[PDB]
Structures are given as structure tokens and as C-alpha cells.
Amino acid sequence: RFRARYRWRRKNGITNLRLTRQVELWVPKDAANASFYVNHYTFDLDDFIPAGTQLNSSPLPFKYYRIRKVKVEFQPRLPITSPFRGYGSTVPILDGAFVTPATGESDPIWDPYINFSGRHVIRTPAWYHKRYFTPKPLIDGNTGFFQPNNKQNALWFPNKQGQNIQWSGLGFAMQKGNEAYNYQVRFTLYVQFREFDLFNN
Amino acid sequence: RFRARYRWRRKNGITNLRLTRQVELWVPKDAANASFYVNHYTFDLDDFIPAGTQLNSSPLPFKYYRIRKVKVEFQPRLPITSPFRGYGSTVPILDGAFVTPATGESDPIWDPYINFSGRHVIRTPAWYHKRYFTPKPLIDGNTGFFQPNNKQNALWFPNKQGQNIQWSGLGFAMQKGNEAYNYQVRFTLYVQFREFDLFNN
Amino acid sequence: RFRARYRWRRKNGITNLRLTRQVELWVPKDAANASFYVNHYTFDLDDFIPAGTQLNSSPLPFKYYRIRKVKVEFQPRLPITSPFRGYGSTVPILDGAFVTPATGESDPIWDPYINFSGRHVIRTPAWYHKRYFTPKPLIDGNTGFFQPNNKQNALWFPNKQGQNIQWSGLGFAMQKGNEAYNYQVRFTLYVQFREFDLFNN
Amino acid sequence: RFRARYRWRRKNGITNLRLTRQVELWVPKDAANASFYVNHYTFDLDDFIPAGTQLNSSPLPFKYYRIRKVKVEFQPRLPITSPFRGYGSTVPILDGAFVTPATGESDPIWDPYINFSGRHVIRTPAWYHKRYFTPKPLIDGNTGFFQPNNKQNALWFPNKQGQNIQWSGLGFAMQKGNEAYNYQVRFTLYVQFREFDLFNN
Amino acid sequence: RFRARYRWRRKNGITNLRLTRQVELWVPKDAANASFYVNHYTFDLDDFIPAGTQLNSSPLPFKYYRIRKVKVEFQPRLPITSPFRGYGSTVPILDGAFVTPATGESDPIWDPYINFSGRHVIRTPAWYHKRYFTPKPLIDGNTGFFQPNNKQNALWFPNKQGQNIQWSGLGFAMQKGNEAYNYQVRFTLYVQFREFDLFNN
Amino acid sequence: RFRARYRWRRKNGITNLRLTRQVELWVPKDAANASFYVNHYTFDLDDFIPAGTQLNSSPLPFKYYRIRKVKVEFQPRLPITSPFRGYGSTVPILDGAFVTPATGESDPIWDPYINFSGRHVIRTPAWYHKRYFTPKPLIDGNTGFFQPNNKQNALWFPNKQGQNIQWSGLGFAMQKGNEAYNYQVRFTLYVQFREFDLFNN
Amino acid sequence: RFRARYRWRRKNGITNLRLTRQVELWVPKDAANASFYVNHYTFDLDDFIPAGTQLNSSPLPFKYYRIRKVKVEFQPRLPITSPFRGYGSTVPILDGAFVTPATGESDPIWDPYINFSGRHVIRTPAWYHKRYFTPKPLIDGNTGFFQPNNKQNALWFPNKQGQNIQWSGLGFAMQKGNEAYNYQVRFTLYVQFREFDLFNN
């Protein structure tokens, strides 16, 4: 009754791991104009797992995977005695279509994520902020479909180490003050793997 | 009550894997003398897992391990229509001290494992034979201690990939007929790992 | 029923003491390179107990000991108005094999403990951080075995005062900003002693 | 329920034997100085079992052993009408580190075992005295670890007949009067053996 | 309910130890006069504990103590075939005022402790005799007060190692025959300590 | 249950006696000035018990004592037809510090004990007055401590016959009329003794 | 049943008051040496109560007292933005013997109270810290006895206003940084008084 779920994890090699990577978020300065810094983050499994050997292509010796949850943690670098407090917005964009502008066009003076249904408020000189959600894989670019949050029906993907697809996550907009502040963004993937394959000579 | 064992496997990264390797057992010929072929098998984790990278030293990214069970399977190569049937003995030698003679001295004409408390009968032209037991790690050579079969109290060992200790397993004695017969020995380790560590750049 | 545990503590002299020592953690400066400071801490009983007399070799007059728990407390020296916040990782490394590099090679630019199963986040200009766990004794260097967390089956060790073995504890990685910050690390051993021996003239 | 312990003793050849050896304890004389005679006893299995043959190395044809209990019996040689009564101390020293001095230094004038947690009083011209305890094997000399008294988790050791390790037992201190008195010390091991192996030609 | 007494012993460092020392009682000879040998014993903690170091003044690293019980054991040196049997008296004198005469005046021909309310009969060539009672501390010499036997209300005293006060114990009177007989008096203190303080460099 | 209190009184010789002594209180005359006569009474055991012999120092052959209660009875000498009635105050002063002035300074014109918490009114030509309380022993003069009224925890004191300490009792203030009136003060001690010692030749 | 405790407080004048005094704790500077500032505090009732008149010697008109509890509150003077954080230790020393050195010898570089059974951690630029315990009166200097924590059996002491004894309290050790920081120590006595005496003219 619960011992059949144990046989399913042993017949197919189901393993929940937790991968963690860090990046630096550099927000530039904006002297008395109240602009925003709109960008985004997608999660590729090649950034969380290093390169393997010639025999074993991946350091995690599994064939299939799916990412259950992502925890995106904006960790401040500045103290709470900063001269300017900002208030941005973080949304999970599962559609793969972001409001991030390309280079050449100016940064907006208004918050584009402020009316979204899943926006949280990032306070942006000195405060921690985490989002914890289910990412959606960027399978197709023509239709851009994703499936609802169903753990039993989530699609499995091959662990390919170099051709690994990216999963659509977060879009943020942070206010810009008179100083260029920093953040240390930490991405934590909660991956579920399947069919352990370890080649040997 | 059972959900505390789930938190213990997630806090320390407990993962049961199943590693498999093969070797060829060549038994020589013995024309009308009824000798035995006494040898043994110890299990080193470096033979089951290949070499890793410079960053990740092992393809299995865990720090600690212990081998729960070994299945040693003598798989025949010859058909059951062989002109001579033999009857040997397989024992689990946990002490690390085998009755295997060195080179230079002759092979015995009598079965040395036949009076042991845990001997099984291998039929040795053409029949399958498996042993499934708990190996014991060869920690010390001066005292040669091992602990009783207790899953909760089994010692943990560092996965070192090149300095991995060997675990004391099986000793066998196979009869030798007028033909050199073959076996394909398959070792299956049921390892339990701990504290998943995956270095990343 | 509980009065038999009282006779066992009186027949063998069982005494739980709590020893405390302090050390200074100096993290150097790193101007705009985002390096890490990876080091470790092992716990030797000779650092917590001073030297005794010629008659009584130890100020704690017991013959055997075992360390039940260690509390490692990183206590800040800097205020929370520091210009740079860092985010490192603390792990209990029971295997005795650390990721600490020797002198001559450079400090890493990436967190090596970030994917470990038992990492906690140390915030590293100004915030307190404690780890509380069971240390493991560094008995052998060839096999590096340790036993699981079982209070009833923990090995007893002679209190020797000068030949006391070290117990494998914590490995940490702290970010380095533009200033050399300080920490006051406090180690608290929760030792259990046995067989009180007090020599007298 | 109890028939599974019967199959475990038959699958692995468990046999409890009781070995007995004797030695002579010579305590020298000490004219009006009230010195002590401090010495010790360790238990080696080579002293209790004689030499075997070339085929069977040991007269007890088992491969593994562990000593459950030792009974050390100081049996007097002198009658109770002796002109001087002495009062010493017997302790079980499991740590392997005794207070026995080497040759060249004088014998102490004070009882060194008198404050120990497990001392019993030996009356030392004419009275019987027995200690009955669990010995601890002297596995390592660097760390000197031993395990708690747990019958289910006691380590097994190879019966090697010539390389057999010694087990740490008793340390005693007997008063010395004006006459050299004698004792007949009787050591009784309660050994448990495993995996009966009897080689045959 | 009983777990509050466990927190009280851990908050204040309560530890029951058992200290033991020995002395020689020399009773002189008295040819056909039937005199008595009246003396006494007080218990100082400096006689049971040796000298410490400069850092830790005492080998027992506690600050406060109180002696719960004393066991005074007169252990014979002579056999039971002695030509003269004597019959003395042992009393616990808690008041601190003994009937022991100074040097210069003769020893009495009559038993002074024989009518006391707490006298026991010591048989004095060859027989063992123990007293087990609560000692009383010699706090003041002007009033000589002591408190009743109440374990919960017993006064705590500083462990000072050189200024330690003496506790009022036993007064004895032993008959003297035609031979100078010996005794080995053994004092066993059952001390309770408090507030473990171990200085460290 | 009550038979254990009987064994305690027989093992230690507990005996409640009742000692009685008398003294004359002379209050002087004071013609039309309304002064007071302030004095006090302390209770020494040497005043209630006479001198003993050389062998037995005290007529009450006990070693320890404590005074449970004192009854101080002011018994009049004058009839109720006296020309002046006075109204003083009696207090139990347990602290040992009285308001009694020394010689040389005048007697007060106001009642000093009238506002005390335990004052009773003595009517002072012709009326009887008793106080019945627990005295407190004058142990120390530097701190002047006493213990609360607890019969089970009362301190025991040596019966020394000549060095017996005094116990702090009553302080009174009686009005003075035109005639010098008399009182016969009767002190009744309710002593409890311990450890009957009767020396004999 | 509870109305007898009301009559006891009215017959003897029992009154619980709460006295409060303040002092300034000046900790000196120590440039890069990591020394400690070890000192102590004893509580005298003459510091909490001012001088009285000639008639009434004390402004609190009671004769006896005992201090039930002391609250020692280290109140910071510096803000939490201080450049150096320190971590000391506060212990209740009831024995009257402190580790405070006299003038002439240097201040220690190590914490002497860190291994004590009742140490709390004072954080020492800017944080509040309170201890709340039962003080012990410094009655004798030769034996230094104190009684256990029993409210019903606590000794009463005379309120003398100028000869009032001191009660043994707290010993602290505070780290010293590059600046001389301040504290405002507040002592709150919870005294219980007895036998209200108010002299009147």
C-alpha cells in the first residue's frame, strides 16, 4: 500500500537530489530618475552539474530527470543602513515570454510586474527574498505549452550534459537608486532522477 | 514514526544503489587426479566504479558508503552435456584469511571448505550458483576484527576512488576435470551511500 | 527499571561534563574577486583540558571518555552595518577528508560545500551561527571508518593527556569581502567520562 | 521466534566453550615498609589453547571467536593463621593502560587503584577473590578504543594460533608483609566461537 | 517530576564521587594492666585529594562540596589465633569534643565510650569493623554547632585545597594486650560536589 | 511509620527535659516622671544546670542539646491594691541586639518596644505575664544570623558546662511609679538532649 | 490552611520590599591583545538603603532581613553599531572566592569563567544581560559555608545600618576591544523583612 511506492523507486531508480548554484546580480545606478532593472532567470541543468568524463558523461549517473521545485534566493550584499530603499517585483513566468527588454532600448520608469497575479515584493538594498515554485520546461518555441502542477504526470527529460533544456522561472524588476548595489542570487533545484546508469570498464 | 526515517535519509543523503561487475573464472584441466581449484574473491569499490574527473573524483558523488550485501553469481559457460560433473564448495570468509595457496605449491586433492559451517555446493561444469550475504570490511591486518550483522550499527567508510578498502567475501573450491571449463562470475554490490557532495564551477 | 541505569553510572563512574574553548577565526580580505576561505576544525581533548600534575596526569581524573556532541558557535566581531555581506557554508565532515587546500594553491572562487547534504548557511560579516552534532573520532587513517549515531554503542577512548586523538568535525567556507573580518569561534564539547581514578599520596 | 536463534547458531556454527588456565602469583617480602605489589593480567587465547597440527592449526577447529566474560580467581596458598593480613585492590582496566611500573623504579607505598570506580578489595594472605567481567580487546595502540558492553554488537576476531591478540583485563595491587606469600591465579574464559572448519585428508 | 532533579544537577554540576584513603593504627602493648587506647579521627579533604597545578588548584575541578557519608573501616592485620582478644568502643562524635587525652597523662583503665548512645563494639586483635554515618563539619570553635541529618539542607563548603576544613567523625577506645597489634584504617568519603570549574589556557 | 521515630530517639539518646530557674527583677522608683525600665534576659544553660564532678562534668549526662522553647513568667510580688498601675512591653528579641541602655545614660521616658511586631503588654504592679517562644542561639557576633523556626532543622550544640553559649530571648520595658516594685521572673527551658554519655570508673 | 500564613506574616511583620541601586561599569581598552576584564560584585544592604536618623537608625524600620533574590542587569551604553563585539561570561559565585586578580598582576588573555556550570554569555559592546538568582551571605571567612536554596530555612540577619554583611553574588569576565565601553549595572534586591520596629518620642 506504501510498499508499492518503494518498489517503484527501486525498479526505476528514483532519487531526489538538491543542486545549488550561485550568481551575482549587479544592478546599476540611476541618479534621480526612478528607473527599473528588469531581467529574468531560466534554469539549465548544465549550470548546476559540471562536466563528466568520456565514459560517464555526467557526474550524476542517471538517464532521466525532472525538476520538481526551484528556490530562488536573493541574498543581499549591502547593510540595512543603505541611503535608498527600493521595492521591486518578482514573478514566476512559466510561459517563457518575459518583459525583459533587449540592449539598445531604455529601462522602464514603471514596474511591469506590479499587476501580475503572482508578484511578490523584493525590497532592494538590503533584504532577503525567496521564491519557491515549480518551474516549467521550455519544450517548444512555436506553441509554448506547459502542463499544470501535477507531480504524478510531470514529463521526464533526458540528462544529456550539454544539450540540456532550460526551464522557465523568474522575472524580476528592481528599483535603481544612486548607488550600484549587489545581490548574490542562489538557485536551488529539487530534481528527481530516474534509471541510474553507471558505465564501467 | 516512519516520517522520521524519511528526514534522516534527506538530512544525510542516504541512497541505496546497486553496482554490478563481471569477471572470468578460468579453471584449468586435471587429467585423472581429482584435484581442486581453490581461490577467493574480495570486493573493492574501485572495480565497480570507474575513474572520475579532476573536480569530481568519483562518478558517484557521495562521500561515505557501506556495502550492505553482495550477490556473487557463478554463471556457467558450458552446457549440461559436459563429460565430467564436479562438486565444489563456496564459503563466505569474513575473517580475511583464506585457504587459497600461493603459487609454487600444488593444488590440493581434497576439498578444504567441505566442513565449513556456511558451505554451499557449486556444481561445476554447467550450473548456476549464487551466494547472497553481508561482506565484512578488511579494516585492520593485525587483529582482523569484524562486527556482527547489524544494519543500524554498520560502519561508514569514505569513498576515496583509488584508496578504497576491500571487503572480505567468498572462498571457493571447484573440482577440475579433463577439460578447462569457464565461468562468468558476476558481483552485485548493494551499497548504501551518504552525504551527496557534487562540486561545481 | 530506571534504577539499574543509576547503578551502571555508579559502578563505572559515568559523568557528563561540558568543556568550552575559544579560538579566533581570521578571514583575510579579497578586493573584488569573490573568493572563498575554506578551512576546517577538528576537536582534540588536549585543547580543552590543561596539563595536570606528575601524579594526576589530567585535571579531570577519569580514565575513559567519549564526546557525545559538539556545539561550534561562530560569534561575530563586526556589527550588522558592515559594507559587505557574505554567505558561506558549514558542513559536518565526519570522514576526516576535507576540501581545505594546502598553502601554495589559491583559494577557490566557488563554494565547495554548497551541494553537500548537511550544509547550513553562515552569513559572514556579522551574524551568529551554531552547529550541534555528533563528532566522529579519527581512529584509522588507512580505512577511515566511523560508526553510525548510536549512543549505546559509542566507542570509549582512553584519556591520555598528550596522546589524545582528534575528532572530525566541521568544514566551512566563508566569502571574503574588501575588509578582513573576525570571528570568535567557540567549541563546546559534551563529553561523557568513565572510571574515576584519582591517585593520592 | 526462538527457533530463529537456533538456525543462526547452526548456520554459523556458534559454540560457547569455557577455557581454563592457571598461573602462580609470587608476591615478594617487604620488611616493615608497607609497600604494594602492582601488576596486571592480559588474556591471550594462545595461553589457553595449545598448539595444533600442520593440517588443523588449532585444537579448537573454529575460525572466529570473541571472549564474552573472564573469571579471574585469586586462590590462596597460605592458611588464615598467617601473621600479616593485607588489603589490596583489583580493577578491570579495559583501556589497556595500567599503573604497573617497569623494572628499575621502586614499588609504591600507596594503593594506586584504591580510588578507581570498579575496585574490589583482595585480602592478601589467605582469602579467595574472584572478578567476573567482560574483557576488551587490544585492537589499536594509537587510539586505544573499545566498545561498550553489548553482546549483540561485539566484534568477531580470527582464531589464528600464534598471532592471537590479547584482551585487556585486570590490574591488582597487593600489600607486602614480612613473608613472601603465594597465590594460584585461575583464568576462566567464556569464549564464543563461529564457523567450524575442520580440514581433512 | 523527576526530570527537574536532572536539570538541577546539570545547572549546578552536581557529582557524587567516592574518595578513599588509608592510615595505620598502631596500638601499643600493655602487660597485665588492662588499659585502653583512646584516640580519634577527623576527616580533612586535603588528605583524600592530592595537590593540583598552578592553574587548577585541585585535581577535582569543582568549587563547592559537602561530605554525605563516611565509612570508617578498621581492617585487621593479625590472625584470629591471637593470644589476647580485646573489646573496645567506636562512637561518632559530631560535637568535635573527644575524650582523647593529651600526651603526658596516662591512658585510662576503663572504657570511656562504653555508655555512649551510639557505641559499637570493635573486637580488637583480628576482626573487621565498619562505621557508616554522616560527618559533621567543624565550622566554629566557640559555639560548636552542627545541623541535624537533612540531605536537602546540608551546608555547602568551598573546595580550597590547603584551607579545607575538617569534619568531626569517630572516637575509639581499643583494649591493649601483651602485644602491639596493628590495624589498617580505611576512610571512604562519599562527597557531593557542585559547580564544575576547569580553568584552561 | 511512627516506630522509626522511636528508633531514632533510642539510637541517638533523645530526651526532652524541662529546666527551671528563678531571678528577682527589681524595678526602681520614679517620682512623677513616667520613665521606663528597659532591660533584657538571655538564657545560658550554665545558669539552669549546676556544676558536676571531675569525671562527669555535667549533672545531665548528655553531650548535645538544643533549647526548643522558653517560658518567661513575670510573677508579681505586690497585691492588686497597689497605688500605681504600669503598662510596659515584652518582645522576643532573637537578633541579639537590644534597646537596653548602658549605665551612665538616663532611662527613656517613652516605650521603645511599643511598636514592635511581637510586643505583649505587661501590667506592672501586680499581674502575671508569660511569654512562650523559641529562643535563638547567639552563635556569631559579626553577622548575627539565626535560622527560622523549624524543629527538624534546628542546630545541635555541645553541652560544655562553663563554655555554654547564651540564647537570645526577651527584652522588656516596665513603667516606674512612686514605689520600687518587685517581680519574681521564672525561666523554664524546654531542652532536647542527645547522645547520653555517662563516664564510669 | 492559607490563613495561618497570613497570621505568621502579621505576628512577625513579614514584608517583601524591592530595593534598587545603580553603578557604572568601566571596561578599559585593549588594542589587539584580546584580554579579559575580570571583576565581581557583592551586595551589601548599606549600599541600597541610605542613612537614617539618631532615633531610627534605618529608613526601613525593620529589625531582621534576608535577601531572597538578586537581579543583576548589565544595561548597555553603546549602540549596536559598535566596531567590536565581545563575548564574556557571568557566573553566580556563592562561595565568596572569585577569580578576580588584584592590582599589579596583568589581566588574563583567556576566559576563566567559561567552563563554569552556571555561566551565561554577556555580549559586550551593546546588549542587555540579566542574572536572577539567590545570593549567599558571607557569614564566615574560615570555613565559607552556605546553605542550599531553601526558602523556608533561610537564615535571618539583623538590619544594622553600617555593620551590614555582604552577600556573595556575581563574577564576570568581559572582552576588551579597541574602545573603552560603558555599562550601567543595576542591582535589584528582593528582600524579606521581619519584626517592624519604629521608635517614637
JSON list of N, CA, C and O in Angstrom, two decimals, chain C residues 30-56:
[
{"chain": "C", "resi": 30, "resn": "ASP", "atom": "N", "xyz": [39.69, 40.37, 0.23]},
{"chain": "C", "resi": 30, "resn": "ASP", "atom": "CA", "xyz": [39.71, 39.96, -1.17]},
{"chain": "C", "resi": 30, "resn": "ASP", "atom": "C", "xyz": [39.00, 41.05, -1.97]},
{"chain": "C", "resi": 30, "resn": "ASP", "atom": "O", "xyz": [37.77, 41.10, -1.99]},
{"chain": "C", "resi": 31, "resn": "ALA", "atom": "N", "xyz": [39.78, 41.90, -2.63]},
{"chain": "C", "resi": 31, "resn": "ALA", "atom": "CA", "xyz": [39.23, 43.06, -3.32]},
{"chain": "C", "resi": 31, "resn": "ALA", "atom": "C", "xyz": [38.64, 42.66, -4.66]},
{"chain": "C", "resi": 31, "resn": "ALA", "atom": "O", "xyz": [39.38, 42.45, -5.63]},
{"chain": "C", "resi": 32, "resn": "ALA", "atom": "N", "xyz": [37.30, 42.56, -4.71]},
{"chain": "C", "resi": 32, "resn": "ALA", "atom": "CA", "xyz": [36.50, 42.40, -5.93]},
{"chain": "C", "resi": 32, "resn": "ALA", "atom": "C", "xyz": [36.88, 41.15, -6.73]},
{"chain": "C", "resi": 32, "resn": "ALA", "atom": "O", "xyz": [37.05, 41.21, -7.95]},
{"chain": "C", "resi": 33, "resn": "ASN", "atom": "N", "xyz": [37.01, 40.03, -6.06]},
{"chain": "C", "resi": 33, "resn": "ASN", "atom": "CA", "xyz": [37.31, 38.78, -6.74]},
{"chain": "C", "resi": 33, "resn": "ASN", "atom": "C", "xyz": [36.36, 37.66, -6.35]},
{"chain": "C", "resi": 33, "resn": "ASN", "atom": "O", "xyz": [36.32, 36.64, -7.05]},
{"chain": "C", "resi": 34, "resn": "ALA", "atom": "N", "xyz": [35.61, 37.83, -5.25]},
{"chain": "C", "resi": 34, "resn": "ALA", "atom": "CA", "xyz": [34.60, 36.88, -4.75]},
{"chain": "C", "resi": 34, "resn": "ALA", "atom": "C", "xyz": [35.18, 35.50, -4.49]},
{"chain": "C", "resi": 34, "resn": "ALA", "atom": "O", "xyz": [34.62, 34.48, -4.91]},
{"chain": "C", "resi": 35, "resn": "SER", "atom": "N", "xyz": [36.31, 35.45, -3.79]},
{"chain": "C", "resi": 35, "resn": "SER", "atom": "CA", "xyz": [36.90, 34.18, -3.41]},
{"chain": "C", "resi": 35, "resn": "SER", "atom": "C", "xyz": [36.23, 33.63, -2.16]},
{"chain": "C", "resi": 35, "resn": "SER", "atom": "O", "xyz": [35.36, 34.27, -1.56]},
{"chain": "C", "resi": 36, "resn": "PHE", "atom": "N", "xyz": [36.64, 32.43, -1.78]},
{"chain": "C", "resi": 36, "resn": "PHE", "atom": "CA", "xyz": [36.17, 31.80, -0.56]},
{"chain": "C", "resi": 36, "resn": "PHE", "atom": "C", "xyz": [37.35, 31.51, 0.37]},
{"chain": "C", "resi": 36, "resn": "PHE", "atom": "O", "xyz": [38.50, 31.44, -0.06]},
{"chain": "C", "resi": 37, "resn": "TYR", "atom": "N", "xyz": [37.04, 31.37, 1.65]},
{"chain": "C", "resi": 37, "resn": "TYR", "atom": "CA", "xyz": [38.03, 30.99, 2.66]},
{"chain": "C", "resi": 37, "resn": "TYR", "atom": "C", "xyz": [37.60, 29.64, 3.20]},
{"chain": "C", "resi": 37, "resn": "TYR", "atom": "O", "xyz": [36.75, 29.55, 4.08]},
{"chain": "C", "resi": 38, "resn": "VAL", "atom": "N", "xyz": [38.19, 28.58, 2.66]},
{"chain": "C", "resi": 38, "resn": "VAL", "atom": "CA", "xyz": [37.85, 27.22, 3.06]},
{"chain": "C", "resi": 38, "resn": "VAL", "atom": "C", "xyz": [38.87, 26.73, 4.08]},
{"chain": "C", "resi": 38, "resn": "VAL", "atom": "O", "xyz": [40.08, 26.77, 3.84]},
{"chain": "C", "resi": 39, "resn": "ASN", "atom": "N", "xyz": [38.37, 26.27, 5.22]},
{"chain": "C", "resi": 39, "resn": "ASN", "atom": "CA", "xyz": [39.20, 25.72, 6.28]},
{"chain": "C", "resi": 39, "resn": "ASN", "atom": "C", "xyz": [38.36, 24.68, 7.02]},
{"chain": "C", "resi": 39, "resn": "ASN", "atom": "O", "xyz": [37.29, 24.28, 6.55]},
{"chain": "C", "resi": 40, "resn": "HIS", "atom": "N", "xyz": [38.85, 24.23, 8.17]},
{"chain": "C", "resi": 40, "resn": "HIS", "atom": "CA", "xyz": [38.16, 23.20, 8.93]},
{"chain": "C", "resi": 40, "resn": "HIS", "atom": "C", "xyz": [38.56, 23.29, 10.40]},
{"chain": "C", "resi": 40, "resn": "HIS", "atom": "O", "xyz": [39.45, 24.05, 10.78]},
{"chain": "C", "resi": 41, "resn": "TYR", "atom": "N", "xyz": [37.87, 22.50, 11.22]},
{"chain": "C", "resi": 41, "resn": "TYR", "atom": "CA", "xyz": [38.13, 22.41, 12.65]},
{"chain": "C", "resi": 41, "resn": "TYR", "atom": "C", "xyz": [37.97, 20.96, 13.08]},
{"chain": "C", "resi": 41, "resn": "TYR", "atom": "O", "xyz": [36.92, 20.36, 12.86]},
{"chain": "C", "resi": 42, "resn": "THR", "atom": "N", "xyz": [39.01, 20.41, 13.70]},
{"chain": "C", "resi": 42, "resn": "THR", "atom": "CA", "xyz": [38.92, 19.13, 14.40]},
{"chain": "C", "resi": 42, "resn": "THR", "atom": "C", "xyz": [39.06, 19.39, 15.89]},
{"chain": "C", "resi": 42, "resn": "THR", "atom": "O", "xyz": [39.64, 20.39, 16.32]},
{"chain": "C", "resi": 43, "resn": "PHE", "atom": "N", "xyz": [38.51, 18.48, 16.70]},
{"chain": "C", "resi": 43, "resn": "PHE", "atom": "CA", "xyz": [38.43, 18.69, 18.14]},
{"chain": "C", "resi": 43, "resn": "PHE", "atom": "C", "xyz": [39.33, 17.69, 18.86]},
{"chain": "C", "resi": 43, "resn": "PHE", "atom": "O", "xyz": [39.05, 16.49, 18.86]},
{"chain": "C", "resi": 44, "resn": "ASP", "atom": "N", "xyz": [40.40, 18.20, 19.46]},
{"chain": "C", "resi": 44, "resn": "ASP", "atom": "CA", "xyz": [41.28, 17.40, 20.30]},
{"chain": "C", "resi": 44, "resn": "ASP", "atom": "C", "xyz": [41.00, 17.73, 21.75]},
{"chain": "C", "resi": 44, "resn": "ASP", "atom": "O", "xyz": [40.85, 18.90, 22.11]},
{"chain": "C", "resi": 45, "resn": "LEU", "atom": "N", "xyz": [40.96, 16.70, 22.59]},
{"chain": "C", "resi": 45, "resn": "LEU", "atom": "CA", "xyz": [40.68, 16.89, 24.01]},
{"chain": "C", "resi": 45, "resn": "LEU", "atom": "C", "xyz": [41.83, 17.57, 24.75]},
{"chain": "C", "resi": 45, "resn": "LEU", "atom": "O", "xyz": [41.61, 18.08, 25.85]},
{"chain": "C", "resi": 46, "resn": "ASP", "atom": "N", "xyz": [43.03, 17.59, 24.17]},
{"chain": "C", "resi": 46, "resn": "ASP", "atom": "CA", "xyz": [44.16, 18.28, 24.79]},
{"chain": "C", "resi": 46, "resn": "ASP", "atom": "C", "xyz": [44.02, 19.80, 24.72]},
{"chain": "C", "resi": 46, "resn": "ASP", "atom": "O", "xyz": [44.67, 20.50, 25.50]},
{"chain": "C", "resi": 47, "resn": "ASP", "atom": "N", "xyz": [43.21, 20.32, 23.80]},
{"chain": "C", "resi": 47, "resn": "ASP", "atom": "CA", "xyz": [42.97, 21.75, 23.71]},
{"chain": "C", "resi": 47, "resn": "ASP", "atom": "C", "xyz": [41.93, 22.25, 24.69]},
{"chain": "C", "resi": 47, "resn": "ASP", "atom": "O", "xyz": [41.92, 23.45, 25.00]},
{"chain": "C", "resi": 48, "resn": "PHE", "atom": "N", "xyz": [41.08, 21.37, 25.20]},
{"chain": "C", "resi": 48, "resn": "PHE", "atom": "CA", "xyz": [40.01, 21.76, 26.11]},
{"chain": "C", "resi": 48, "resn": "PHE", "atom": "C", "xyz": [40.39, 21.57, 27.57]},
{"chain": "C", "resi": 48, "resn": "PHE", "atom": "O", "xyz": [39.80, 22.23, 28.44]},
{"chain": "C", "resi": 49, "resn": "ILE", "atom": "N", "xyz": [41.35, 20.70, 27.86]},
{"chain": "C", "resi": 49, "resn": "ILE", "atom": "CA", "xyz": [41.75, 20.36, 29.21]},
{"chain": "C", "resi": 49, "resn": "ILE", "atom": "C", "xyz": [43.22, 20.74, 29.35]},
{"chain": "C", "resi": 49, "resn": "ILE", "atom": "O", "xyz": [44.02, 20.37, 28.50]},
{"chain": "C", "resi": 50, "resn": "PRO", "atom": "N", "xyz": [43.62, 21.48, 30.40]},
{"chain": "C", "resi": 50, "resn": "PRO", "atom": "CA", "xyz": [45.03, 21.84, 30.54]},
{"chain": "C", "resi": 50, "resn": "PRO", "atom": "C", "xyz": [45.91, 20.68, 30.99]},
{"chain": "C", "resi": 50, "resn": "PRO", "atom": "O", "xyz": [45.45, 19.54, 31.08]},
{"chain": "C", "resi": 51, "resn": "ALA", "atom": "N", "xyz": [47.18, 20.96, 31.25]},
{"chain": "C", "resi": 51, "resn": "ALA", "atom": "CA", "xyz": [48.08, 19.94, 31.74]},
{"chain": "C", "resi": 51, "resn": "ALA", "atom": "C", "xyz": [47.88, 19.73, 33.24]},
{"chain": "C", "resi": 51, "resn": "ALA", "atom": "O", "xyz": [47.59, 20.66, 33.99]},
{"chain": "C", "resi": 52, "resn": "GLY", "atom": "N", "xyz": [48.04, 18.48, 33.67]},
{"chain": "C", "resi": 52, "resn": "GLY", "atom": "CA", "xyz": [47.91, 18.11, 35.06]},
{"chain": "C", "resi": 52, "resn": "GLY", "atom": "C", "xyz": [49.25, 18.09, 35.78]},
{"chain": "C", "resi": 52, "resn": "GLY", "atom": "O", "xyz": [50.22, 18.74, 35.39]},
{"chain": "C", "resi": 53, "resn": "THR", "atom": "N", "xyz": [49.28, 17.31, 36.86]},
{"chain": "C", "resi": 53, "resn": "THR", "atom": "CA", "xyz": [50.48, 17.18, 37.68]},
{"chain": "C", "resi": 53, "resn": "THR", "atom": "C", "xyz": [51.25, 15.93, 37.27]},
{"chain": "C", "resi": 53, "resn": "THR", "atom": "O", "xyz": [50.94, 15.27, 36.27]},
{"chain": "C", "resi": 54, "resn": "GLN", "atom": "N", "xyz": [52.28, 15.60, 38.04]},
{"chain": "C", "resi": 54, "resn": "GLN", "atom": "CA", "xyz": [53.02, 14.36, 37.80]},
{"chain": "C", "resi": 54, "resn": "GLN", "atom": "C", "xyz": [52.24, 13.15, 38.32]},
{"chain": "C", "resi": 54, "resn": "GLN", "atom": "O", "xyz": [52.24, 12.09, 37.69]},
{"chain": "C", "resi": 55, "resn": "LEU", "atom": "N", "xyz": [51.56, 13.31, 39.45]},
{"chain": "C", "resi": 55, "resn": "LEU", "atom": "CA", "xyz": [50.76, 12.22, 40.00]},
{"chain": "C", "resi": 55, "resn": "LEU", "atom": "C", "xyz": [49.49, 12.02, 39.18]},
{"chain": "C", "resi": 55, "resn": "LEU", "atom": "O", "xyz": [49.28, 10.96, 38.58]},
{"chain": "C", "resi": 56, "resn": "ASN", "atom": "N", "xyz": [48.63, 13.03, 39.14]},
{"chain": "C", "resi": 56, "resn": "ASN", "atom": "CA", "xyz": [47.44, 13.01, 38.30]},
{"chain": "C", "resi": 56, "resn": "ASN", "atom": "C", "xyz": [47.77, 13.70, 36.98]},
{"chain": "C", "resi": 56, "resn": "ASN", "atom": "O", "xyz": [48.03, 14.91, 36.95]}
]
